[PDB]
């Protein structure tokens, strides 16, 4: 299935994924297309942070969902 | 029912081989709690202070992280008004945590991701923040035995 | 000249931060509103709920992702088409003492891009019955001890058999009997194999996993940066300038502001490459941790960056690629960004221009959120 990963600068990245795919697998697909190390990526879906050890399925992410690739970490 | 092997043996090594510059010993009543004393590093704004921390080993330890809180009041970007600390691999251990807390005192300048009020003051008015940390050190971390 | 390239991008990043991408401030505000609409509290004073999220937003502070910083530098020094060509070419693994990168730096204006990987081998295990094992929902990057098989479930959720016999696995499974150690870590320094059958089985399983992991690809990219190596009139004063951001620590603006590019430049080319090569070949975490700190900490944190919980326990590997930089193209890209900023965000100094850009971004974010969550 296809999902869209959108950035703050207005970039949209289209990914071919399976619902079983891990968040880490999504970040490696982003690395393949944009050259960003998965360790220095944050993913957001409908207000919620996507944690690496989880799957797309853990967040009920279905076909043609839009994720946000956040590239400024903030926390505390 | 009682403590797991891991905590018994790690506590023994922690008492036999303490972290240099750090006092850490289990509570006499509940061996999952540790009373910690860290000296303010020389040349830091915390010089002269001694800082008491409580460290707690949750039932999930080491598969979950120890919980840690300053009991001494301290002006630091990574420490809030409750003494909670902002900073987990179950391959790590208590001494690893203590080393990281000590390093926080040696290099208090805030990392970029921090956004709390003390971190912002330390970032925008560093000389004033340092003077404030020294005042709190003298007020709360000294005459504190 | 190449040195002018370095001074200009440093000056502009220092002065302008995130504005270096030449994105209209209203685009950032609108995209941040899209990202953050779910952060706004649904009850109470919604206008006040919106204002809180906008205040807390940081859409006009620079990226601190090292990969985004590298993309920014590549696009500016190479142009969009040139950066796209650079990305198409392959990474080379840095050799043992860095000789292959040394022999790839002729005396021209050059841009290096580095991708560093860490070896993210499993540290956890658990027992499980075959009928219970669901790789989709099971904890990832982890060893599973079944009654008839030993497997590794990688970060992508693929099952990898570790080549043990059913007899071996049955014994190991039934030797680990304490409830606490059903789900635990490998390589725990506090077990004593000579004290119990369980501790011996845990150690034995750890030795099996360690040997199998030697031939399993556990590499995942952890850091990214670029090195500008300008043309030098004499090869004896040829210096290099590393550029980076770092996720948990700092932006490229702060890197430049603290002059760490210049500090690392004082090592010289051979001195820097030799430290980078040792980082990728050393098997000692105490050596690895120091060099990592020296090279990649923000200025002033070199001695604490990789201490305690951040000790560098895992093998690293350094990969690089090199391409030539046309200073006229680089300077033209930087000047067009400067023209964009001066046209759309005019001001007496850089600080005024940055504040104007920020106020405009906050207003765009506010208007979009209020439009979507209130009725005028």
UniProtKB/TrEMBL annotation, chain C:
Domain annotation MvcA insertion: ranges: 122-218
Protein name (record): MvcA insertion domain-containing protein
